[PDB]
Amino acid sequence: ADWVTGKVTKVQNWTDALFSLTVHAPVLPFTAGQFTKLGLEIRVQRAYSYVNSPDNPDLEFYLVTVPDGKLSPRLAALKPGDEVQVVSEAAGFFVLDEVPHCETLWMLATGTAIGPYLSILRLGKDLDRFKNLVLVHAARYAADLSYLPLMQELEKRYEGKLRIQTVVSRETAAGSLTGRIPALIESGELESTIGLPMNKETSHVMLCGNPQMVRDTQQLLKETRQMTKHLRRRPGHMTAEHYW
Ligand SMILES: Cc1cc2nc3c(=O)[nH]c(=O)nc-3n(C[C@H](O)[C@H](O)[C@H](O)COP(=O)(O)OP(=O)(O)OC[C@H]3O[C@@H](n4cnc5c(N)ncnc54)[C@H](O)[C@@H]3O)c2cc1C
Numbered sequence: 001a002d003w004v005t006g007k008v009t010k011v012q013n014w015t016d017a018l019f020s021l022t023v024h025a026p027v028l029p030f031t032a033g034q035f036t037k038l039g040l041e042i043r044v045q046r047a048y049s050y051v052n053s054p055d056n057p058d059l060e061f062y063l064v065t066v067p068d069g070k071l072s073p074r075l076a077a078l079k080p081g082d083e084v085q086v087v088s089e090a091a092g093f094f095v096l097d098e099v100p101h102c103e104t105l106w107m108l109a110t111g112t113a114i115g116p117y118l119s120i121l122r123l124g125k126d127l128d129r130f131k132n133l134v135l136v137h138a139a140r141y142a143a144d145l146s147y148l149p150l151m152q153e154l155e156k157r158y159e160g161k162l163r164i165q166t167v168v169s170r171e172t173a174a175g176s177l178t179g180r181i182p183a184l185i186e187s188g189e190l191e192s193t194i195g196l197p198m199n200k201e202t203s204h205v206m207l208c209g210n211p212q213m214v215r216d217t218q219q220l221l222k223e224t225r226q227m228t229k230h231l232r233r234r235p236g237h238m239t240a241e242h243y244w
């Protein structure tokens with residue numbers, strides 16, 4: 001991996017813990033859904049999904065400060081003009097190309113894991129093959145839904161093809177379902193609220209983020225919907241990308 005020097009052009013502090021960085025670095029083109037590594041000499045490096053469309057040079061990263069973590073608190077300290085090292089070649093297969101044909105593509109993410117979906121929907125290529133697109137972002141509190149405004153513009157842009165839903169687990173917030181993704185699927189509430197069923201006949205489900213959410217959802221979908229982990233060598237219905 002060859003590292004290049006990037007400059008933070010903008011810092012978006014959504015909450016005390018959530019922030020997005022916009023970086024100009026001479027990186028190579030990537031496929032929406034992919035990730036690169038960011039690093040600081042403390043060289044400590046971590047993977048971060050691109051949030052920007054691959055066609056937009058303002059690289060965007062959505063992060064959360066992990067208090068006891070080594071790199072996140074340092075990136076949280078960066079100010080515009082500061083340098084950060086970035087791997088120029090992207091990696092990752094959490095991309096449309098690896099997604100089978102299906103009538104409804106479900107994109108579920110917890111916390112900062114919504115980034116890859118946003119890159120994909122912002123670029124907006126190769127989506128004609130899906131009749132319905134569903135984007136679900138789950139967080140603890142409503143204040144944590146940093147990209148709700150973007151999701152709303154995207155929904156308008158897609159003229160009904162894309163349905164968006166936010167889920168919050170610790171409060172009641174107008175506009176969101178209260179709960180955890182696995183529970184809402186099981187109770188039929190997610191599908192009822194979104195207006196589309198999630199089954200092996202019509203759907204592919206993309207899961208990204210907290211590994212517990214991913215594992216729980218995958219186990220529930222396997223047991224109750226007979227859905228399976230998708231592999232190149234064994235096509236299925238679920239694609240996952242854990243952030244830890
Ligand atoms: C493919 C991939 C893409 C990722 N993309 C992003 C991204 O865009 N944004 C981002 O915020 N993180 C992302 N991560 C997570 C990331 O690389 C880091 O682990 C991170 O920011 C925390 O690093 P640290 O050095 O602060 O923590 P570490 O000292 O390395 O400690 C990590 C611990 O912090 C917790 N943790 C790790 N990541 C998170 C997270 N996203 N949310 C809540 N808790 C976390 C976990 O419990 C993990 O056990 C990604 C990881 C992978 C594998």
